[PDB]
């Protein structure tokens, strides 16, 4: 077994955010942790992006600090696999490196990883770092500049259940303040940390008792001094003999999860809350402290972190919803909100379910996820590519160029060109334009003029004009009537293409030395000659500007493009990179989308070039073939005119992205999704929270509360507290309007949904597996399977089947209904009397959470006993247990690759693949599935499904969605291919600088607490694709063994076209 994993969509949810002076002393930065990605911003007046890096680990801890005599702040990061590091920001010119000041692994092999997980704290005097990794221990990294491998000592903590810790301000020796739990209740203790005697001395105040659910500790800075303990009913201040205690009624009805210091002295603090409310915590000084106050600011999305920036701007980082930038206002709005959203950052959120549909009924798939939870939950329609919306398309053939023409604002005209002819449209020619003063330019097959010779190549801007007659060049300037000739030169070879985008320079492509050159203007002299190599001439050339940097672009006739870094004064060409895009010669052209200039490349793979991370990205236009193009305003405004081989077209263009995400808000948690094509609509399980009434109500309007048809369950089988109310939503495939909502019984959860046909019945049903859920019980002892048909307009209940457990999973199986009922797998048949009757079942489970099928085979993913393989023996009408993996993997998602190969995600962020052993002594060696591939993903996988986002060397294609919003892809490799990739996997590790100097082999190693094996049968496509973004000096370090660097570009490129 040989698999290749790669990322289709990087993780979107926010684990952490921190604010400080990281890039410079005078810059104010926002640092954001997504899972393995670290984002770095500068605060403007918005956010200017500077650097996004990736690490080889889940970032568990991230805080800035500044040692004595340090120019700017240093960054401390700790990963979940226990990699510690200190990073510095160094920007020596055009280049930016996150350089590793110190690094080390701080794991012990004796250890209970705790509830509340990792906690990472730094001392105010920056003398020390404190970690709580395991119960009863406390690890200490002493921060003198000598300790560069980050060697650490442990102190033993007699408190075996710690909730939160902080270092305090204003303490002689360094002092930790923490809330712990024994019986008796929860308490606050303080220890001082001796660095030289190495263990705990006793602290300032004595041990006080706090609230049963006291959960957060804020350390107030020195003007005040103590610690604030946040709990569910009360906020309290503690300092020695000082104790203030407010218990405001507002904060009762939801839990506070995050906080942030707003005013540096500590007078004001932001509080975030599980239902999305934002609070200000106000310390009123009198340098005593008289009172605490809580004021409600407004609603945000549900905050995982909070960070005040400058000037009333708060960044709200979410993991259950979109992240946002919001403005805090002195004055309330018309509804009492001091909060106002400025910007919103898409989080594909917890992906809890997804399916692949060819919605726009062409050949390209779209993902449709269940995203988010509570009021942030939504569907996301995810489409690959950049689409263009047609508004008119004249069926006109030929066409070898077009231009737009503007005396005020609007574009008005649109000029075409054909062999030797030229038609002009408002319903041969080289250029058409609007130039200085008045008049427009027009350049024909021969002359605007020279000495009976034919112009062969043209170029122009607002004020200057360069034409080429054979190898001769001329320099024209536009003056208040007709064009005065400036310069004259002859090139050593024939001119192929020409650009002068503004003008002190001139880009030129020549005919026999395959050259691209920069020439001074007017001098025409040669500032830089670059040999492109090869034996195909350039077809278009172009200089432009992407995100403040300058570039040269030269399309060759074989569809390759080159791009360099332009100087604009020196004219030097730097950092040659080469991108394949299509097979026929590309025509380059600039256009504007937002306030950015991009480039439209026209080949049989139309592409838009732009700049994301100050690197250039190439993204496909979802069009068959484009030959010419230009921007319009005349079809009408803000548009693109595009000619293909055999007709024209005009229209608008999508956001310039790799992925298009349409978002459908629901204001409740969606839980499962499935497409029913004959009804052209979607079934979505969702739940909403309602609260014990004065009699159950509903906190806000939701998708189920505002459907466009309702119904409520009819069934008489089972004859301020909160509670989930579940529904099946019917969702129009085109408008995504919620057509119908059916509500289930009180305390019934819908956990599983299918859309299938059954038996010889010609109807297509929605089938819902449910469970009766009471917090008292451990597992459910009652649930039901319900058979709905979407008739027209409304849902009617066709069948019902009571069962003795939760229906965790269901799947259509060969005309029958396979189901998991709470540690039993069962097979139902569909009678002519419209009824489910049992056929067989299987009880050798602990909790069958996950089913998938293929032919007569069934993959069963268990709560804790890993995976097992079942068969339906169709003659005997039975289940046959074929084999089983005998490892203690706690499953999250499961998928069948082929009939011999089964894929699985476990709750430790690992992937494995199981095979059928093809060995002798069948009865036991063939009853054991062998793990044949291991790989640490770093993500928790909720769903696999078969399908692909792409199609308008590898085999098969499985997408997966994760809690952190990353969408991933798995595919199969030939053995020829895996060994080659595995090879240059290890060559790339020797060359790629890893942030924190974490080793890639360690990162991807399979890791539980039972065992830690290295990864096998698995290729990290993220790592293989990083080959395209390194030096060519370092590329050649990676080609020592007949191979050439330009050859592996081809291989790695072909693999990027996979997602």
């Amino acid at each position: 077994s040989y698999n290749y994993v790669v990322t289709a969509q990087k993780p979107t949810a926010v684990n952490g955010c921190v604010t400080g002076h990281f890039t410079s002393a005078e810059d104010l930065n926002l640092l954001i942790a997504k899972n393995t990605r670290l984002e770095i911003y500068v605060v403007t007046a918005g956010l200017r992006p500077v650097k996004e890096v990736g690490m080889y680990g889940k970032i568990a801890v991230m805080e800035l600090f500044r040692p004595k005599g340090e120019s700017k702040d240093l960054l401390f990061i700790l990963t979940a696999k226990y990699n510690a590091c200190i990073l510095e920001y160094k920007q020596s010119g055009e280049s930016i490196d996150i350089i590793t000041r110190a690094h080390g692994n701080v794991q012990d092999r004796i250890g209970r990883p705790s509830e509340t997980g990792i906690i990472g704290i730094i001392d105010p005097e920056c003398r020390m770092i404190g970690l709580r990794l395991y119960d009863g221990l406390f690890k200490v990294i002493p921060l003198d500049r000598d300790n560069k491998e980050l060697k650490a000592f442990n102190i033993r903590l007699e408190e075996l259940h710690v909730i939160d810790v902080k270092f305090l301000y204003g303490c002689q020796a360094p002092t930790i303040c923490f809330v712990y739990q024994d019986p008796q209740g929860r308490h606050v203790k303080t220890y001082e940390v001796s660095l030289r005697e190495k263990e705990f001395n006793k602290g300032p105040w004595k041990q006080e008792n706090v609230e049963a659910e006291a959960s957060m500790v804020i350390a107030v800075p020195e003007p005040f001094g103590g610690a604030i303990i946040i709990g569910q009913e009360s906020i309290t201040y503690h300092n020695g003999d000082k104790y203030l205690a407010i218990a405001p009624p507002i904060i009762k009805q939801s839990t506070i999860v995050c906080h942030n210091r707003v005013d540096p002295n500590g007078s004001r603090y932001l509080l975030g809350d599980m239902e999305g409310r934002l609070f200000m915590l106000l310390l009123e000084k009198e340098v005593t402290l008289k009172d605490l106050r809580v004021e409600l600011l407004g609603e945000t999305s549900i905050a995982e972190c909070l960070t005040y920036l400058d000037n009333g701007v708060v960044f709200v980082g979410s993991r259950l919803g979109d992240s946002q930038l919001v403005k805090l206002n002195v004055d309330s709005n018309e509804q009492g909100s001091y909060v106002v959203a400025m910007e919103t950052f898409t989080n594909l959120g917890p992906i809890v379910d997804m399916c692949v549909v060819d919605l726009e009924r062409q050949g390209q798939g779209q993902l449709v996820t269940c995203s988010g939870a509570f009021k942030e939950g939504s569907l996301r329609i995810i489409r690959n590519g950049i689409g263009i919306h047609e508004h008119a398309s004249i069926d006109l053939p030929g066409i070898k160029g077009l231009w737009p023409l503007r005396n005020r604002e609007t574009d008005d005209t649109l000029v075409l060109s054909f062999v030797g002819q030229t038609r002009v449209l408002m319903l041969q020619t080289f250029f058409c334009g609007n130039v200085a003063h008045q008049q427009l330019i027009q350049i024909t097959s021969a002359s605007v003029e020279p000495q009976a010779k034919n112009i062969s190549v043209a170029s122009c801007n607002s004020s200057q004009v360069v034409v080429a007659v054979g190898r001769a060049l001329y320099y024209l300037q536009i003056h208040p009537q007709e064009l005065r000739q400036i310069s004259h030169t002859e090139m050593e070879h024939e001119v192929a293409c020409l650009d002068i985008t503004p003008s002190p320079l001139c880009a030129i492509g020549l005919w026999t030395d395959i050259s691209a050159r920069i020439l001074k203007l007017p001098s025409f002299e040669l500032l830089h000659k670059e040999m492109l190599g090869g034996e195909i001439i350039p077809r278009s050339i172009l200089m432009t500007t992407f995100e403040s940097s300058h570039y040269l672009l030269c399309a060759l006739g074989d569809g390759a493009l080159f791009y360099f870094g332009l100087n604009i004064e020196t004219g030097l060409l730097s950092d040659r990179k080469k991108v394949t895009l299509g097979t026929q010669p590309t025509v380059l052209r600039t256009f504007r989308s937002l306030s950015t200039t991009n480039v439209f490349a026209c080949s049989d793979r139309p592409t838009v070039i732009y700049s994301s991370n100050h690197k250039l990205v190439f993204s496909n236009v979802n069009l068959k073939e484009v030959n010419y193009m230009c921007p319009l305003n005349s079809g009408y405004p803000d548009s693109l005119a595009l000619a293909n081989n055999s007709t024209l077209t005009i229209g608008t263009i999508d956001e310039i992205q790799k992925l298009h995400i349409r978002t459908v808000p629901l204001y409740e948690s969606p839980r499962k999704i499935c497409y029913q094509e004959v009804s052209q609509c979607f079934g979505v399980l969702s739940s909403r929270i309602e609260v014990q009434d004065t009699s159950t109500t509903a906190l806000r309007p939701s998708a189920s509360t505002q459907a466009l048809s309702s119904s409520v369950s009819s069934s008489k089988l089972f004859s301020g507290e909160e509670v989930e109310v579940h529904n099946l939503l019917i969702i129009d495939q085109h408008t995504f309007e919620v057509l119908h909502a059916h509500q289930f019984l009180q305390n019934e959860y819908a956990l599983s949904l299918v859309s299938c046909k059954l038996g010889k019945d010609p109807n297509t049903y929605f089938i819902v597996g449910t469970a009766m859920v009471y917090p008292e019980e451990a597992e459910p002892k009652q649930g039901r399977i319900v058979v709905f048909q979407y008739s027209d307009g409304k849902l009617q209940t066709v069948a019902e089947k009571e069962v003795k457990g939760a229906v965790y999973s269901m799947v259509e199986f060969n005309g029958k209904l396979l189901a998991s009922i709470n540690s039993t797998v069962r097979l139902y048949e569909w009678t002519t009397e419209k009824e489910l009757r049992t056929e067989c079942n299987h009880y050798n489970n602990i909790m069958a959470l996950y089913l998938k099928t293929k032919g007569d085979f069934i993959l069963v993913g268990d709560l804790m006993r890993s995976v097992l393989l079942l068969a339906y023996k169709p003659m005997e009408g039975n289940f046959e247990e074929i084999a089983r993996d005998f490892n203690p993997n706690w499953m999250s998602a499961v998928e069948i690759l082929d009939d011999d190969n089964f894929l699985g995600a476990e709750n430790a962020f690992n992937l494995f693949v199981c095979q059928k052993d093809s060995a002798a002594t069948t009865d036991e060696e063939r009853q054991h599935l062998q793990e044949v591939g291991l790989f640490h993903l770093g993500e928790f996988v909720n769903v696999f499904c078969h399908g692909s986002l792409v199609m308008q060397p590898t085999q098969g294609s499985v997408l997966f969605g994760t809690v952190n919003g990353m969408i991933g892809l798995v595919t199969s490799l030939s053995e020829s291919w895996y060994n080659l990739l595995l090879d240059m996997q290890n060559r790339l590790n020797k060359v790629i600088k890893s942030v924190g100097k974490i080793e890639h082999s360690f990162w991807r190693s399979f890791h539980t607490e039972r065992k830690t094996e290295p990864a096998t049968g698995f290729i990290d496509g993220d790592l293989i694709e990083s080959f395209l973004d390194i030096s060519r000096p370092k590329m050649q370090e990676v080609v020592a063994n007949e191979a050439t660097a330009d050859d592996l570009i081809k291989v790695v490129e072909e693999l990027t076209r996979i997602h």
């Binding site: 839980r671 959860y749 859920v773 917090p775 019980e777 597992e779 959470l849 709560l863 999250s892 928790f940």
Partner: peptide, 13 residues
Amino acid sequence: NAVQLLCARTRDG
């Protein structure tokens, strides 16, 4: 309760 624990875990709540 397993169902809620599971529902929570899928959120990683």
